[PDB]
Amino acid sequence: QTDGIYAAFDTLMSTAGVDSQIAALAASEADAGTLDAALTQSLQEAQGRWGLGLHHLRHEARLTDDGDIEILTDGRPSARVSEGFGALAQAYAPMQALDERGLSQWAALGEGYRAPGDLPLAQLKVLIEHARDFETDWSAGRGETFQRVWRKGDTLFVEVARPASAEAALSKAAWKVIASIKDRAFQRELMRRSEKDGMLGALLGARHAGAKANLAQLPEAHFTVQAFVQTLSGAAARNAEEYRAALKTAAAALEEYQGVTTRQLSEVLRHGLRES
Amino acid sequence: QTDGIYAAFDTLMSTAGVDSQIAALAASEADAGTLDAALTQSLQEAQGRWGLGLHHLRHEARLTDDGDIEILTDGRPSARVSEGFGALAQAYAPMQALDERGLSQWAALGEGYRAPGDLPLAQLKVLIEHARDFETDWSAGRGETFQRVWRKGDTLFVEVARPASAEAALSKAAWKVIASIKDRAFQRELMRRSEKDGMLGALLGARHAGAKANLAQLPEAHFTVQAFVQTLSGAAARNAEEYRAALKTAAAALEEYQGVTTRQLSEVLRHGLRES
């Protein structure tokens, strides 16, 4: 009932393109402090990619005596992996504050002044070079993306985000997955239930028993890639050239990981087609 | 001490140009708790002006159960008023770090990055308008002053300093009083004794023996107005014109308080030699 938990964590992490390899690390008999550090590292990466908007909280995950993995924010028990992925998404929901574009409204640094996102590159240079902590608001970035930047202590953070809901991603991963099926009326009656209802709807109505009870386990229904944070440290975190390069890097990686998680999703969705 | 612990504190406070009025407050119909608060407000004001360079510490002053005034840095007892002013100066001294010019090497914001103090004013403007907490190193300013600036939260702190030891200030007041002497014979002897053992030397000389006694118990021997801090809040704290105005204001306030305490010291050294 709490077994297959390392693998459950690994699958959650995969929806963010994080090959956390936690199961393998436990099979190698790694010490529990090691597993704890690895769980936390992966979760913080995933948090960099999920786009939920919670950089102002501390994200940890840790083993419990009863074989569970406990996820926490600012140290408060938020959820347990055994309670399922929908339960985790529900745990995060009240701590979010998304605007109309889906972008987070919270300041990464917390309460305080936020410089504009459109700032002239010379002004931003002065902030990078000579300020202590600082933070810009969202600005448009390229190809329907948005970007921002902030420095906490010794580390500069460059975030690039293109919000995209998880439901839609699932339905398009089911577009490819159905697309690979017999040209037949299962299709035409999914597609004619596309001019009437969402695609989990038409695919839970046109399928057989356990389509919903099976799919209610997928983490990809609650989590998907929407941003990418590239970090810099030390002298680089006060160098404007490094920041410009890091922005290029974060946009590139956004493209990459969106593609990669799409591929892994359609693959395992197609693994469910062979099983059927 | 002399005529009370509240008198003793007011006399200290006068060294920094703070008319703290604690003796009057204690003799009044004020609410209970009003005195400790007065003491701490006056003390922090004073710290902005003595130039000891301790902005990173929290200063407080509070009554004790045996009727004394205790002075604290970061909650720790440092000294008590009745122990005398030399003792207070010596409690501060090991906390201080003054470079050759007399200026604090301590950041006001503590450990971290400091911008240069000769920064181009357009860059400094970007910091005032868009950064959060930040701080600059000392630089020169108008009229042999030095200046630095920093933001803590919603307040911008502009400091202007013209270091001068309590000894140098005593020497300037001794010079002043040796000038205004009406009797010329005494003045010829004083000026000879001063071509020899300096100005205050001669001056304390001509008094009755033990001249250096008594005055050495005055606080003027251990604290003197060396600097001034002007504060801005709200929108003004993010306005670079306000910054430049605030600098002129703090420079004027400093030249005033130094002229003042020079006059008051010149009165100290006059009411013990004229009656000779």
Do A49 and A225 touch, CB atoms closer than 8 A? yes
Q: What is the rounded distance in angstroms from the CA atom of residue A231 to the CA atom of residue A154? A: 10
In angstroms, what CA-CA distances link A4 with A7, A274, B223?
5, 23, 71
Q: What is the rounded distance in angstroms from the CA atom of residue A128 to the CA atom of residue A120? A: 12
Do A148 and A136 touch, CB atoms closer than 8 A? yes
Number of Cβ within a 10 Å radius of residue B42: 21
Place of tokens 């009240």: A94
Please work out, in degrees rounded to the nearest 5, the angle formed at the alpha carbon of residue A81 by the alpha carbons of A75 and A82. Answer: 130
In angstroms, what CA-CA distances link B155 with A269, B235, B239?
56, 10, 12
Coil/strand/helix, residue B230: strand
The tokens for B153 are 């939260």
Q: What is the rounded distance in angstroms from the CA atom of residue B271 to the CA atom of residue A179? A: 104
Q: Where are the alpha helices (DSSP H) in chain B?
A: 5-14, 22-26, 34-50, 85-92, 121-130, 166-179, 184-197, 199-206, 212-215, 240-268
Q: What is the rounded distance in angstroms from the CA atom of residue A215 to the CA atom of residue A54? A: 27
Size of interface A-B (CB pairs under 8 A): 45
Whether B113 and A135 lie within 8 Å, measured CB to CB: no
Shortest alpha-carbon distance between residue B251 and chain A (Å): 26
**Chain B neighbors of A109, CB-CB under 8 A:** 132
The tokens for B167 are 């000894």
The tokens for A218 are 């997928």
Q: Specify the DSSP class assigned to residue B105.
A: -
Strand-pairing partners, residue A233, are: A155
Whether B131 and A135 lie within 8 Å, measured CB to CB: no
Model resolution, angstroms? 1.8
Q: Which amino acid is at B255?
A: E
Whether A109 and B131 lie within 8 Å, measured CB to CB: no
The tokens for B259 are 């002229």
Which among A238, A268, A11 has a CA at the least distance from the CA of A129? A238
Shortest alpha-carbon distance between residue A121 and chain B (Å): 11
Backbone angles phi, psi at A149, to 5 degrees: -155, 145
Closest chain B residue by Cα to residue A110: B132
Do B60 and B40 touch, CB atoms closer than 8 A? yes
Q: What is the rounded distance in angstroms from the CA atom of residue A255 to the CA atom of residue B121? A: 40
Q: What is the rounded distance in angstroms from the CA atom of residue B96 to the CA atom of residue B53? A: 6
Q: CB-CB: which of A115, A132, A238 is closest to B130?
A: A115
Q: What is the rounded distance in angstroms from the CA atom of residue A124 to the CA atom of residue A119? A: 6
Question: Which of B109, B113, B121, B233 to mutate to test binding with chain A, by most A CBs within 10 Å of its CB?
Answer: B113
Q: Which amino acid is at B155?
A: T
Which among A31, A11, A63 has a CA at the least distance from the CA of A217? A11
